[PDB]
UniProtKB/Swiss-Prot annotation, chain D:
Glycans are attached at N35. This is Spike protein S1. Binds to host ACE2. RBD also interacts with the N-linked glycan on 'Asn-90' of ACE2. Cleavage of S generates a polybasic C-terminal sequence on S1 that binds to host Neuropilin-1 (NRP1) and Neuropilin-2 (NRP2) receptors. Interacts with host integrin alpha-5/beta-1 (ITGA5:ITGB1) and with ACE2 in complex with integrin alpha-5/beta-1 (ITGA5:ITGB1). May interact via cytoplasmic c-terminus with M protein. May interact (via N-terminus) with host bilirubin and biliverdin, thereby preventing antibody binding to the SARS-CoV-2 spike NTD via an allosteric mechanism. The gene is S. The chain holds residues 200 to 248 of 1273 of the full protein. Attaches the virion to the cell membrane by interacting with host receptor, initiating the infection. The major receptor is host ACE2. When S2/S2' has been cleaved, binding to the receptor triggers direct fusion at the cell membrane. When S2/S2' has not been cleaved, binding to the receptor results in internalization of the virus by endocytosis using host TFRC and GRM2 and leading to fusion of the virion membrane with the host endosomal membrane. Alternatively, may use NRP1/NRP2 and integrin as entry receptors. It comes from Severe acute respiratory syndrome coronavirus 2. It comes from the Viruses.
Length: 42, 49, 49, 49, 49
């Protein structure tokens, strides 16, 4: 579905949220804290 | 013999190789805030006086 | 501000230089030596902003 | 100015990267501003095989 | 007037010895320079002398 970029993971630094859906994509330059890609859907 | 505030003790420094990394053991160093010139990038700068 | 316009900040301490056209907005503690600090922001570890 | 150089070549018949020359063209370009040194992707985990 | 000190005094009244450094770094002949403690020498291998 998409790609993830950034550095140091935690909210200490910002990150990327590339993802596609049907006929859409959204990007977010935000300090995203996570642990795995699991984008629940299908 | 640290002088009083009203009569402060001024010292002039002459031509010297000054290393601002050995004085950390000279005082407890409760506060070491510094102004525009940074203490980290302080041992790479040359001063008039 | 007659009292203080403490609404603007700027960094002084970085591990290295900075390339052109990017931002280094982050709230961490500068090591400023081998002396390790963890958010203490005391002596030998100064707030970058 | 993120680059999305892409092309669709469904002529593959099973071999991984079959010997052949093909071009790539960007689609969408946009600057964000970040020190990126990490890469990851998202997979269809809820229904995989 | 008198500025005596007592060990029984708590925070805000204890004697705080203070030393301030003033720098006049400007486009002028330099008398004091902070060094790199120097890096040791090597032979028979290409280096930036
Ligand atoms: C693709 O996913 C995005 C979020 O990842 C969703 O965006 C929605 O788009 C519709 C279009 O009108 C809006 O009304 C919603 O408010 C959006 N949601 C969010 C959370 O922003 C949507 O699922 C897809 N994008 C589309 C359809 O443009
Ligand atoms: C200010 O400087 C020092 C710091 O307290 C005082 O002590 C002498 O300073 C001279 C340099 O001017 C040195 O050569 C001496 O070695 C220092 N010690 C002694 C015991 O003389 C100096 O007296 C102070 N001067 C004042 C307050 O007028
Ligand atoms: C992007 O951020 C990472 C965060 O770790 C940087 O990695 C650090 O870089 C500094 C400066 O070179 C050094 O302390 C180490 O190489 C790294 N430290 C740690 C703790 O990982 C990386 O250099 C940054 N990239 C850019 C271009 O600034």
């Amino acid at each position: 579905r998409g790609w993830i970029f950034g550095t140091t993971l935690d909210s200490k630094t910002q990150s990327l949220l590339i993802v596609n859906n049907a006929t859409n994509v959204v990007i977010k330059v935000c300090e995203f804290q996570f642990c795995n890609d699991p984008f629940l859907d299908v | 013999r640290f002088a009083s505030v009203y009569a402060w003790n001024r010292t002039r420094i002459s031509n010297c190789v000054a290393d601002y990394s050995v004085l950390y053991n000279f005082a407890p160093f409760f506060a070491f805030k510094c102004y525009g010139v940074s203490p980290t990038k302080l041992n790479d700068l040359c001063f008039t006086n | 501000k007659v009292s203080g316009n403490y609404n603007y900040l700027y960094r002084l301490f970085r591990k290295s230089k900075l390339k052109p056209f990017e931002r280094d907005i982050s709230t961490e503690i500068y090591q400023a030596g081998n002396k390790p600090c963890n958010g203490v922001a005391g002596f030998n570890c100064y707030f970058p902003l | 100015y993120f680059k999305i150089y892409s092309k669709h070549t469904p002529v593959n018949l099973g071999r991984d990267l079959p010997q052949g020359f093909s071009a790539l063209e960007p689609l969408v370009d946009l600057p964000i501003g970040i020190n990126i040194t990490r890469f990851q992707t998202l997979l269809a985990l809820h229904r995989s095989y | 007037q008198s500025y005596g000190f007592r060990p029984t005094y708590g925070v805000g009244h204890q004697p705080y010895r203070v030393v301030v450094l003033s720098f006049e770094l400007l486009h002028a002949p330099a008398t004091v320079c902070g060094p790199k403690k120097s890096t040791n020498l090597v032979k028979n291998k290409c280096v930036n002398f």
